[PDB]
Every structure is written in structure tokens, then in C-alpha cells.
Ligand binder design. Structure first.
Ligand code: ZN
Ligand code: ZN
Ligand code: ZN
Length: 572
């Protein structure tokens, strides 16, 4: 019952009982909270409630200290002090932004803006409160009791009446009943059990509600600049392959943390792994939120770093298959490849945090909490996709509010910028360079003359809310008959249900924009599907068209993004 004031650190016995996280508040700040919000329950060793038998007054503003106990106006003795007076709440050791964070429901973009422009201790309160709210919201959805099992990849479901039905995408991972995690796709539904199990009829699914642990460490440790490379020993023999990155590698050694903005195909993996070869004795933990981001860092390490000094950390509650060519769960190897949520408690010379646009402030804090390191390197791109905010339905979250690193990158600039895209035909590089990189991204490749755009609104049907555009798929089917080189193309759209239809009609492999992030393919076919905020988001569009190494076909719904594409227009 004794702790520090989440606003000014001052010791107190006073927690707010109305805040979902029950933060410790000092007398001066607990007042400014209760007097300006619907929050009136103040906890101590014992709650600030009327001690009179049967009295239900819990509002600290209506309570008084009578000797040792607390009473309301109706019950207090003649000699009694009001608990709230003179800008304080009586406690031992005797905020506008804190109020907005503490009370918001996290459905509005402005909630995320504030959780990212506030003080550092408020960024942790914000992140804890948000994640708790996200988790206690999951308790508010319908169960899917299995009616019948068609095959090993399809079954039918009966849905609980009175509670809403959650979106059936790869984003929403259920828990079967403890028959392991289970996802679904687009009355025949496509079931995907993490553990292979002959699905029993009557068995029920419920969503994976995890307990939100408190945060302690800041999002970003305080910044230190050094005169010389600190606690790292560079090679003199550095392979020409990594000669480009030498000055940035010395920058990494000469400050506590560094930010690298690398646009698509600019050499992020190359940079991350090239750091190990430039500081060859340095212990490096390689971390990202997703298994796929960590597995990409593994593939690059496999090519350049000795395989005996590399470990892939895999949590015993295995969710999806991941990188299988390192020693598994050897925490003490020089090179450790681990998702944030599985990180062990250890130390390092360098921590490399990759795909930083997908990190939340909760993720940034957990890393600083589990890994004590001489240098933190933050790699990603604020022009790429953020983590989905399940509760955010109103307003759009701008890149400068994704997390503390993206905010730094969007305000003061990144410490290091990889400025040459080596993956994409020039037509794509020129488009995104102007769209999201203020003309600072340069093309290595020539124009491919295999980058095509077509303006075709088509017809938009919906599977619930997920959009489908069959005529857009029809246009692709026609294009494929005349363009056999594209038979190998990955189909990409902003919608699962569009992808499900494209899968059956075209037989192409299928990716959402969001699942395509970090991947590259020779040929991409993109159907915008709709002109919504979701399908027109410049970050999503940037990711969509930068997957392609040789050619891209964009069937567009939005005039603006269509006119911006520096592609050959097709007719029909
Ligand atoms: Zn305070
Ligand atoms: Zn409160
Ligand atoms: Zn009373």
C-alpha cells in the first residue's frame, strides 16, 4: 500500500481505485485527479469510505477524517477535517493529460496522440491502461461452439446469442477447448489449429485474454552521446559488402540509442547483421514483435554470422512455426533472435529492435525492462504499417504517434536514413519517394516497364465489413490471359475476403498488405478493392507497391493514389 506518484514520484499511500490500473498518486496530484474526473474512490491501507455501519459514501470529496477513521458529512464527528481541501487529499508524506489517459475508452485517435506526446511516466501509464482496456474488452464477445466438421481445413460454427461476433481474420487468434490456439478465414469457414487436432463437435473457442503486467522501464532510456565508441571494439578488416554502413556503425557506438529509418529494400537486415561483423566480439540481441520479423533477421544472420553463436528463442506455448536452423532456447549464445514477448532477462552490448513501426510503447518498455545493454538500435520505417489498435475506430493514427521511436523519427528526424531502394523498379521507388519520403528515396534499379495501373472502381460487396470487388478480380483474370509472366504473381489487397475470392478465381497466392510487410515477390497484383481510409492509407499503399522486385499491376479505386502512381496506365 506504499508507492510512488505516477506524475511527480512523491511517495504516498493514495492509489486511485477508479483507474483500471490503480496508480499511486501523491496528495497534491490525487486531488487534481478526483476534483476534475468521475474518479472519486481513493485507496490506502484501507479504502477512503465512510466507516459508519451501512453507509455507502465512497466519494473522497464527500468524506472527512474523524480522529483515525473516515466518515461522510452525515456521520463525521464535530472535530473532523475534509479529506479533500487546500489542493490536497489527506494521506501520508503530505495531470490534465493524466486525467484524459485515465478516463478515455481508447476508441479515438486523440487518445493515442496524448499517450505519445505526454511525459515518459505517463507513456507507461497510458500503455498499461490501453493494454488492460484492450484485454478486458476481449471478455465482451460471443463463443463459437462447433456444430459440424467438414474436413481437416473446414468446419461449421454456432455463435453465442446476445454477444457480438469477432472479425474472422489471422489477427484474431482464439484458444480452443486447452487444445492450442486456433484462427479462421472466409456456411463453410476455414479453421487453422496451431496444434493438429481432429476438431471435436461441441468443443468451444474463446479469445486469448492475457493478464497485463505493469511497466517499470521507460519506452526509451535517456539519450547519451559519447566522444568515442563505448564498450564496443570495431574490426579494421570490414568486408566491402558492409563498407557503406561504417560511419553509421561508428554512430551506433558513439550514443546510447540510435534510430534507423530504412524505406523498403534499402538494406535494414543487411545493416542489422553488418553491425555484428563491425563489432565482432559484441553480444547482440535481435528482437521484433513478430516471429516473421525475427525469422527474417535469422535468415540474414545464417548467411553472414557463424551458426554456432546464434540461438532462436522460442516460447514453450508455440503459436506458429518459425526459424529452425539455429540452436533453440540457448539464451547465452553471442547472437540471440527472440520476439519481444518471449525475451529472457539478460544483458547485451547491442540490442537491435527491428520493424519498429509495428512496436507499441508497451513493447518499447518491455524491451528496456528485460534487456540491459550498452547500445539500443531501433530499425524500421514510420512510412510503413503500425500495430493494429483493436479499440481505435475514430480518427487516423499518424506515424509520429505509432510509438516513441517513430515520434523521434517524425519530429527530429532519424539518426540514420538508408536512402537507396535496391528491390523495386524505379516507377515504384519514384512513386513512394514522392508519396511518403519527401523525395529522399533513390532508385538503384532502372524502370522495369512492368509496372501497370488501371482505374476500375468495379462493385463492392461485403462479407460483414471485409470488402470484396469481384469485377476488380475479373479485370486481373483478363490481364493474366495476356500476361503469362505474371502467373507466378502474389495477389495483394487490403482485405482478407477479397483475397479469399482472388484465391479461388485466380489460384494466385494471396497476402493482405499488412501480412506482406517485410516480404518481396517478383510480381505483385494489387486490387485496392474499395476507396476507404483503410484502402487509401498512404503507409498501407507504400507497403503494398514496394513488395514488387520486377512488376506490379494496381487496379485502383482512388483517383488521387491512381494519379500518383508513376506507372503505365492500361485500358478497359
Ligand atoms: Zn504527484
Ligand atoms: Zn483515476
Ligand atoms: Zn456516512
Amino acid at each position: 500500500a506504499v508507492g510512488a506518484c505516477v506524475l511527480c514520484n512523491s511517495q504516498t499511500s493514495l492509489r486511485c481505485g477508479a483507474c483500471i490500473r490503480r496508480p499511486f498518486l501523491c496528495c497534491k496530484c490525487c486531488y487534481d485527479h478526483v476534483i476534475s474526473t468521475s474518479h472519486k474512490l481513493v485507496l490506502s491501507v484501507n479504502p477512503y469510505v465512510c466507516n459508519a455501519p451501512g453507509c455507502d459514501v465512497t466519494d473522497v470529496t464527500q468524506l472527512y477524517l474523524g480522529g483515525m477513521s473516515y466518515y461522510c458529512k452525515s456521520h463525521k464527528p464535530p472535530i473532523s477535517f475534509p479529506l479533500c481541501a487546500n489542493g490536497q487529499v489527506f494521506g501520508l508524506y503530505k495531470v490534465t493529460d493524466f486525467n484524459a489517459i485515465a478516463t478515455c475508452d481508447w476508441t479515438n485517435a486523440g487518445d493515442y496522440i496524448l499517450a505519445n506526446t505526454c511525459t515518459e511516466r505517463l507513456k507507461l501509464f497510458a500503455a498499461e491502461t490501453l493494454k488492460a482496456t484492450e484485454e478486458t474488452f476481449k471478455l465482451s464477445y460471443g463463443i463459437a461452439t462447433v456444430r459440424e466438421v467438414l474436413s481437416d481445413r473446414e468446419l461449421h460454427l454456432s455463435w453465442e446469442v446476445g454477444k457480438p461476433r469477432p472479425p474472422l481474420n489471422r489477427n484474431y487468434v482464439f484458444t480452443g477447448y486447452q487444445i492450442g490456439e486456433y484462427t479462421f478465414e472466409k456456411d463453410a469457414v476455414v479453421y487453422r489449429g496451431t496444434t493438429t487436432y481432429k476438431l471435436n463437435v461441441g468443443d468451444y473457442f474463446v479469445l486469448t485474454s492475457h493478464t497485463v503486467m505493469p511497466l517499470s522501464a521507460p519506452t526509451l532510456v535517456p539519450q547519451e552521446h559519447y566522444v568515442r565508441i563505448t564498450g564496443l571494439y570495431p574490426t579494421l578488416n570490414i568486408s566491402d559488402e558492409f563498407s557503406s554502413n561504417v560511419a553509421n556503425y561508428q554512430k551506433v557506438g558513439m550514443q546510447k540509442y540510435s534510430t534507423l529509418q530504412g524505406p523498403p529494400g534499402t538494406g535494414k537486415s543487411h545493416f542489422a547483421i553488418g553491425l555484428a561483423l563491425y563489432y565482432p566480439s559484441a553480444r547482440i540481441v535481435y528482437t521484433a514483435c513478430s516471429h516473421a520479423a525475427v525469422d527474417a533477421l535469422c535468415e540474414k544472420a545464417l548467411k553472414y554470422l557463424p551458426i554456432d553463436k546464434c540461438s532462436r528463442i522460442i516460447p514453450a506455448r508455440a503459436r506458429v512455426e518459425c526459424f529452425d536452423k539455429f540452436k533453440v532456447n540457448s539464451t547465452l549464445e553471442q547472437y540471440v533472435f527472440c520476439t519481444v514477448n518471449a525475451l529472457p532477462e539478460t544483458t547485451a552490448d547491442i540490442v537491435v529492435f527491428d520493424e519498429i513501426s509495428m512496436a507499441t510503447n508497451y513493447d518499447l518498455s518491455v524491451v528496456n525492462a528485460r534487456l540491459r545493454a550498452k547500445h539500443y538500435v531501433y530499425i524500421g520505417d514510420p512510412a510503413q504499417l503500425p500495430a493494429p489498435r483493436t479499440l481505435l475506430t475514430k480518427g487516423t493514427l499518424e506515424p509520429e504517434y505509432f510509438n516513441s521511436v517513430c515520434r523521434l523519427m517524425k519530429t527530429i528526424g532519424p539518426d540514420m536514413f538508408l536512402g537507396t531502394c535496391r528491390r523495386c523498379p524505379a516507377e515504384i521507388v519514384d512513386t513512394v519517394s514522392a508519396l511518403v519520403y519527401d523525395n529522399k528515396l533513390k532508385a538503384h534499379k532502372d524502370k522495369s516497364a512492368q509496372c501497370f495501373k488501371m482505374f476500375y472502381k468495379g462493385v463492392i460487396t461485403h462479407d460483414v465489413s471485409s470488402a470484396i470487388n469481384r469485377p476488380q478480380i475479373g479485370v486481373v483474370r483478363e490481364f493474366l490471359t495476356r500476361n503469362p509472366a505474371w502467373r507466378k504473381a502474389v495477389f495483394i489487397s487490403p482485405y482478407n475476403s477479397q483475397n479469399a475470392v482472388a484465391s479461388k478465381i485466380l489460384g494466385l497466392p494471396t497476402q493482405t498488405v499488412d501480412s506482406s510487410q517485410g516480404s518481396e515477390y517478383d510480381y505483385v497484383i494489387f486490387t485496392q478493392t474499395t476507396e476507404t481510409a483503410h484502402s487509401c492509407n498512404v503507409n498501407r499503399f507504400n507497403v503494398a507497391i514496394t513488395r514488387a522486385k520486377v512488376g506490379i499491376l494496381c487496379i485502383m479505386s482512388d483517383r488521387d493514389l491512381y494519379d500518383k502512381l508513376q506507372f503505365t496506365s492500361l485500358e478497359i
